């Protein structure tokens, strides 16, 4: 009978969770070894342990059928059982699983090992994305130099892994169907536990798209004055290599040439960080300070002992793309970041430490609940702190911003600077998954895979490649997450919900009142707020133990993902910018790109 079975089921779960945590620990150690030191041998060890854990998960899935778990009284027990039924890639036959891991390894190591020749010296051929190419893309205003680095990088990071990417799409699809999802798109979407989630994001995106179009138009206008009309057209998509980022995902690196009020201050603290002797260690210690200032958990000694916070100097290959790692024991949590002393890197440190904090908050949960309420929640945590850190208010307190007068014009400069990171990114992030979903769902023929990518980038972001591409190129894997098989919708979700978290934290901290001109949302610093700290604790400590609306409700009483808060933040910018574009007769919108030939 079922009452007795449910009692035994609870004990089965308790043991199985602990066993999965320990087995995952071992797989994580091997993955860490590889990612911090790419070698054929580390690859082999990583993929071998994953294969073994996959075989165990298959037995676990099979063993859950011995329990009438859908008949149980406990919502909690049923939730855990449901989580253990979901195998993902581990559902594949052993041989196909191994081929998928090999394919994944080939793509991620191709990405991490890209090097290109110096534009001014074709004997010097050891320039990596991080830091060398990224420095040129973010700093050079030589449009031909920029186009050179763009083409070299995309050809090597993108086109070179076409045939591997194709096999990955096939195996990803096969795995999804073995879990009885239509495709990998529905397998990813299942993490949001909401069958209207795509519609909800379309609705929110459509409400913010007008503001994006205004920013796009203004930036295009300013780039024309800088580079001239031979480089940038009034009416066409923006050539993406001029936007300060290899993927045009964020444009804050060209703020100095597009800022609303060039005579008025624009916050860029990198030079002061350098002047005051900041190191990667100091930046992490300051992030730790921020969390503990809010009455959240301090980093444990394992973090300091085992993290990698600067690029190795020993010539090894590694993945430099910044990441946070849970080892699934107690207090073994780590970051791997090739840290540089810049403003944007200070924000990255806070981003990654948000993942760390989450891990620490939920580490007492059962293994299956030791993850984010949804993938977007995980990405949002550290960004809520980065929003504070970026404020003039905070940057003056820590001595990084000197002689700053916050008049109306400085405020618009700062709002615009923020928008170049937070609004511009939204169409970018949506396209990353729209593209992959379309491949996974079998909606695009293989003959059209490259132009289907640039078509989306055109339609949603109004950008295009600097040179003509064709179906001979394959550009999508030039972005880390695409080569590395990391779902990207989490970042779209994060960029919306982080404003709901920020706004609520700010109110709880006494730092935001809509009816008080002294407390605008865009100068809120939650540093030192135990009240904000508490809201985080209430939410993060839940892990994935409840559906994400219940996690949001624990934070601020709401249950709905909403674009209201991000619009509220940028509202003064929207008003100003709409007026400025009219005043300057700025063209809005773009013709269809001709930069991808079929
Ligand atoms: C994805 O969807 C798939 C379907 O599209 C699904 O695959 C199905 O899983 C079914 C559930 O496990 C499975 O059902 C069993 O089928 C056996 C007979 O099938 C053979 O003949 C078919 C031709 O008709 C072939 O096509 C198949 O390939 C098979 O070779 C049955 O013998 C079997 O039965 C036993 O199991 C039930 C268990 O009953 C449940 O459990 C308790 C036990 O206490 C019951 O009391 C309770 O009420 C409940 O019924 C017993 O009732 C029975 O007495 C036997 O012990 C069972 O029906 C089915 O074969 C399979 N079909 C396919 C592949 O098409 C995947 O499982 C889905 N995957 C995921 C990840 O969810
Ligand atoms: C990297 O891994 C290899 C194993 O393939 C090992 O022998 C080598 O010493 C490692 N290097 C570092 C820097 O740890
Ligand atoms: C900090 O959190 C603890 C619980 O961990 C709580 O009891 C205490 O009130 C909080 N301290 C502050 C500074 O509010
Ligand atoms: Zn992250």
Numbering used by the authors: 17 to 614
Quote what the paper states about this structure.
Angiotensin-I-converting enzyme (ACE, EC 3.4.15.1) is a promiscuous zinc metallopeptidase with a number of substrates, including the vasoregulatory peptides angiotensin I and bradykinin, the anti-fibrotic agent N-acetyl-SDKP, the neurotransmitter substance P, and amyloid-β peptide. The active site is located at the centre of this channel, marked by the location of the catalytic zinc ion, which is coordinated by His367, His371, and Glu395. The high-resolution crystal structures of AnCE in complex with the dipeptides VW, IW, YW, RW, and WR presented here reveal dual binding in both the non-prime (dipeptide-1) and prime (dipeptide-2) subsites of AnCE.
The RW-1 arginine shows significantly more interactions when compared to IW-1 isoleucine and VW-1 valine; this is likely due to a much larger charged side chain, resulting in it being able to interact with more distant residues. The arginine interacts with the S1 subsite residues mostly through water-mediated interactions, with the exception of the arginine side chain directly forming H-bonds with Tyr496 (also observed in YW) and a salt bridge with Glu124 (which has moved relative to Glu124 in native AnCE). The arginine also forms a salt bridge with Asp360 and hydrophobic contacts with Ala338 and Thr364. RW-2 tryptophan is positioned towards the S2′ subsite, and the arginine sits within S1′, but in WR-2, the opposite is true. The difference in orientation between RW and WR likely favours RW binding due to the tryptophan occupying the more hydrophobic S2 and S2′ subsites. Interestingly, RW has a Ki value of 200 µM (0.2 mM), showing a significantly tighter binding when compared to WR (840 µM).
